[PDB]
């Protein structure tokens, strides 16, 4: 994470959790859903706002 | 205790650059076609009769 800070790629390195069967990353995760039928770009700009 | 170790935030990151220079270029296209003879003459009879030879 110090040597990989180079130009071309946005390389991200990490370690799996201790039980690989349960997920692949520690911490929280959530979904943002479109209920009213609004388009994709509105949900994209909402994700950027979040 | 402590163990903060605030890293230097300002980095001004390195950027791969290419300087542009003016260079002439030609433009050419590949197109499909057929070949044809310079002159074709189909021999047709100007009279009536049987071909003897």
Between the alpha carbon of residue A12 and those of residues A4, A45, B33, the distances in Å are 8, 24, 54
Task: Report how far apart the first and last C-alpha atoms of chain B are (Å, whole number).
Answer: 119
* A8 close to B (CB below 8 A): yes
Q: What is the resolution in angstroms? A: 3.2
The pair phi, psi for residue A43, each rounded to 5°, is -70, -30
Q: Do B15 and A8 touch (CB under 8 A)?
A: no
What residues of B are in contact with residue A2 (Cβ under 8 Å)? none
- What determination technique applies here? cryo-EM
* A2 close to B (CB below 8 A): no
**Which 3 state secondary structure label does DSSP give A49?**
helix
CA dist., res. B40 & res. A12, Å (int): 72
What residues of B are in contact with residue A7 (Cβ under 8 Å)? 14-16
């Amino acid at each position: 994470m110090h040597f990989f800070s180079f130009k071309d790629a946005m390389v991200f390195a990490f370690a799996p959790p201790s039980v690989l069967e349960l997920g692949n990353a520690t911490g929280f995760d959530l979904f943002l859903q479109d209920q009213a039928g609004v388009g994709h770009e509105v949900l994209l700009q909402a994700r950027n706002k979040f | 205790c402590g163990k903060s170790e605030a890293p230097p935030p300002a980095q001004t990151p390195e950027v791969g650059i290419v300087t542009l220079e003016a260079q002439t270029v030609t433009l050419n296209t590949e197109l499909p076609g057929r070949t044809n003879a310079f002159r074709i003459a189909e021999v047709r009879p100007q009279v009536n009769g049987i071909i003897l030879k």
